[PDB]
Amino acid sequence: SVSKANVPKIDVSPLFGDDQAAKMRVAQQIDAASRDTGFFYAVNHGINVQRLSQKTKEFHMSITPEEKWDLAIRAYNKEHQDQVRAGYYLSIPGKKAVESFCYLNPNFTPDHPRIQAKTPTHEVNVWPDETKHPGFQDFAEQYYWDVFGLSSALLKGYALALGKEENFFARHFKPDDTLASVVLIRYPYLDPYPEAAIKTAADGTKLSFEWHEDVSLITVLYQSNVQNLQVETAAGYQDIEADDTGYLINCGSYMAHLTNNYYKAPIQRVKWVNAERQSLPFFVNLGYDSVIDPFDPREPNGKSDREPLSYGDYLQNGLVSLINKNGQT
Ligand SMILES: CC(C)[C@@H](NC(=O)[C@H](CS)NC(=O)CCC[C@H](N)C(=O)O)C(=O)O
Incomplete structure (x- = not known):
């Protein structure tokens, strides 16, 4: 009843x-994948994803309720009005299974002019106690770079692929202004698993997270070896096989906007699976004032009707819209 998406390596x-x-030749492969299902697996990437998964697990499994409140974003802790993006996203036992930790550009400090100006979507990262989580902040900041x-290399491929x-x-x-973020999502094993945390799609599939499009330029995602993701095609949702050695x-x-939908943002969703697993996305975001002129690779003149969209405004509206539609994560 459900087929499998062709996700080339x-x-x-x-x-x-x-x-x-x-x-x-790489760019050609990126082009064909972006025109097909929209997904590929980057391999021979040079990142030690074993250490990434290990450190992330040690953090997820040792952080205490007290620490989570102390790092909680505004949605869970009213005392932290400045934490709209960075911080801990608490689970709700019996209601919400997923929990996560999000951090931003480590260069966002109190000295950064965007922080000084209080520009939306810019925040200073919060971190647990170094002694309680030895080496976590240093590992996490290095992983960001x-x-x-x-991602910089991948973007080179996408650029060549589009001519x-x-x-x-x-x-x-750029390191001095990227709005990009890392999210360390834990999907827990629960017995019994709360039904309030399980959604039923229109087609009957049980989901942990409903359909959505990524708010990003590109998404660079690591997940453990537990199949969960699905991509929408005209013939229905298709399963994306898991690969815990590469990046989706x-x-x-x-x-999608800047290419007049030539490279579409795939509609993705998360199947429900009662298994302890990790979902660690890196959202490749540009600078607050970055503006890329839209174009249409389908046209000889490459002309597009789409307005140039400032990335900062796109990000702010995109993240709020995603929360309004798919709920507070
Ligand atoms: C692979 C995805 C489906 C993953 N979830 C996600 O990527 C989720 C929901 S679409 N992403 C978000 O909510 C956007 C996080 C943005 C971040 N807080 C920031 O300020 O930069 C998962 O595994 O649940």
Whole structure:
């Protein structure tokens, strides 16, 4: 009744190199995947995802209720009015199974001019006690830059795939201003599993999270070896096989906008599965004032009707809309 999506594995290592022709061959694979289901698996990425999964688990399984309140975002703790994005997202036993921890650009400090200006979507990360979680902040901050370097390379491939120079996107992806975020999501094993946390799709599938499109330029996602994700096609939702050695990549809704929907943002959802697992997305966001001129690779002139959209405004509205539609995570 449910088929499987074709998610090809793409060796992205040439995108770190200087072999321009081998990088074009990668870009071709990115193009075909973005025109098909919208997903591919980046392999030969150079990131130690075993350590990522290990450190994330140690954190998830040792953080206490007291620590979670102390780090909670505004939605769970009224004392933290400045934490709209960064902080801990608490579970609700009996009602909400998922919980997570989100942090932003480590360069967002009290000295950063965007923090000084109080610009929306900019926040200073919060962190647990170093002695209670030794090495976690240092591991997490390094991972932000590890996956940032991978994402920069991926963006080179997407740029070439669309007929642009390889810095078309990456020039807007900078350490000093990127709004990109990491989210460490824990999906717990629960017995009994609360029914209030399980949603029933229109087609009858039991879901942990309803359909949505990523709010991002691209999404660089690691998940443990538990199949859960599905992508919508015209013939219905298709299962995305799990691969806990690589990264699941897809374009976000900002990419759809700037390419006149040539690279669509795939509609994705999360099947319910009673299994302890991890979902660790990196949302490749640009700067608050970054603006990419839309174009249409279908057209000889590449002309597009779409208005240039400032990334900051896109992000703010996108994250609020996602909360209004799919609920507070
Ligand atoms: C792979 C996804 C379905 C993953 N969930 C997600 O990506 C979820 C829901 S779509 N993403 C979000 O809510 C947006 C988080 C944005 C973040 N707080 C920020 O300020 O930057 C999962 O595993 O649940």
